[PDB]
Amino acid sequence: EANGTETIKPPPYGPNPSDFLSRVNNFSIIESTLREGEQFANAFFDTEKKIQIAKALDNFGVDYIELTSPVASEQSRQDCEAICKLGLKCKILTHIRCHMDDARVAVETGVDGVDVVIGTSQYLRKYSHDMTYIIDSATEVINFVKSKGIEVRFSSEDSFRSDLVDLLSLYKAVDKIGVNRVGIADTVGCATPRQVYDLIRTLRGVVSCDIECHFHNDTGMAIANAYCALEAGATHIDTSILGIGERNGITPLGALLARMYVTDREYITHKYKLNQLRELENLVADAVEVQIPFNNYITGMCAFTHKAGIHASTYEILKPEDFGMSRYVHVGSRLTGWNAIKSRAEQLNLHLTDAQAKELTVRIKKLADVRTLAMDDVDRVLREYHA
């Protein structure tokens, strides 16, 4: 009787004009473990380690890897040269301040492009016969770099706290000069997704070149902001392995990939070697001496777990085979010692030998001897082993 209502139906429901601008299954990662990652509290990468991380990334499938400025130190100039000489498939970028010395050094090292950042004293606003200009000094740099055949991206810092009048006018000016990309950076970690959406949609209307986005994760928006940026027309996203960067970091590589996988499995699965992801995180985890968080996306202990029983299959939007794993683990009890190793190793496709099981089981004991295990102890103890 009184427990019903007329059914709410809508009043031909194909794609919206806005959908055509979306880059959600056609974008590039710019991998920044070797620039932004160097600002992580425990990053002290030496050349060899930089080289490995670079090879692994190129092999994993990213389109670009960004390096710390060559001008920053002499060790950087060298490492830049070193990495530019490996023959990687992906393009190699370096980050510079907007200056003629920084650029000369940058192209000397052999990069494929410079990510240029501009300072307030390098552009002005004035009425003339109101008008906004890049100064003559600055503009020469862009032209220089262009004339040496190198790609130029142009950015402003703290993009979400700048005057919009300033920012947009500047990006338009730079677009008239002609560059490959303009970048947007949430340095401070304060941007919200719909706010990111409006800004990129507008930028996409203002300029004609490509658009790059860089988001910090202070407030848990880095992955969401990158997503909305892609929806609005952004063509490139900076990521970092495990997100490592300044403070709690930027858009994490794996997290981004998890989100884009759900949106288009075929595209992500074929472009990137997803079963290589654990390996990639472990190599960085080792160098910066951190543990893979228990709740880390895809690769953390509990990402692929279902509670069995008293607090409990088609709620599995991520398929473990696509990322090198074998199954969701159905957890009904607190596994201890060997039991816990066996479960994770099996999930992870490690074909452990008789002796290895022992070496591990013994070590896990010597650990609990010091204090109680954490469930991240299981992943740590297994870090050295491969599928």
Place this chain on the structure above:
Amino acid sequence: SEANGTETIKPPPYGPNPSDFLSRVNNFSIIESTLREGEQFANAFFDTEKKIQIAKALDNFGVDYIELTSPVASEQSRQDCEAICKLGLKCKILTHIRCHMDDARVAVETGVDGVDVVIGTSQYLRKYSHDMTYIIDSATEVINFVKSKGIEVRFSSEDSFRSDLVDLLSLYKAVDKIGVNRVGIADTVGCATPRQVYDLIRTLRGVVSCDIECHFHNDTGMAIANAYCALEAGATHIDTSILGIGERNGITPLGALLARMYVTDREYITHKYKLNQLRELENLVADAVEVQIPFNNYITGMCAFTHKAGISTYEILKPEDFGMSRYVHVGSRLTGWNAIKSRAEQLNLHLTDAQAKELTVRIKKLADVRTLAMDDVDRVLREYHA
């Protein structure tokens, strides 16, 4: 200046939009679900004493609601509800139930302030009558029963972003006609996106007149961003979990949420919640479910308040507001006591000459097993308080 410049892009009197009036970003309630959804975490096995501490600490922290596992799930579960409903918490106490008169009867018996009801496909139908949606007579009895005993009702559906919109919105409307405190939306699977969430919540806000609760899993990194957009669109209640703990990688984490809402409105959050108690709260749960605080955990993880030094403008979170003393400026790999000292002073622990020793030996006995993690510093210090 030269040739290559442009005319300044300027807009064409600007104030708040009508949409802004519906936002709940500085006026919402947390429903804290460490004791329901958190029980589904791979390593969660809370006994009664531990459930009691967690409830007391959440109440003190300032959350408005705490959610408990269904009293029909098990006997221990029934008893723990009774136990917690008797503690005299300030916050309201809710339990989660399948929509059945038996489950409802025992929920009222235990003493809850409210039942979060989830309905199953067999309990509502579409039919033409002189295109109509109905909640079934025996399902509806449950709602009225609960209301007749003076207990709050929230009604929801599972896997809301994957349900047919026709069914879902029709059901919520019918429910609203019957009359309930709240309806709920849940992204059970972790696939929803913030603009999707906004659209759906705004529409729901237009369909029903009651309150709106949201539940978001974090499989794809959207849980916090979904919570926020849900709030902008009119949602009134967000489910959280300490450290996000739940099924798989969990739901919107309490700490993370509070960080996001803090930036949006410092005064509101700082005054409503005891932010300097977040760490102790996380550590209590970390201890029980035997995990370590992620190094990049929001606010409280080792690296949240670090600046690299080397080869105050950029500090949207103020360390003093969360009981800490400063951003640490890192130029070196601190080792042994150096690293303890740094973090301890950052966390405002005034350690004894003796306690420093106990810690230094222990961090050694730890690195003498395998090379250290930055997570180890927070781990050895877990037992110490400001």
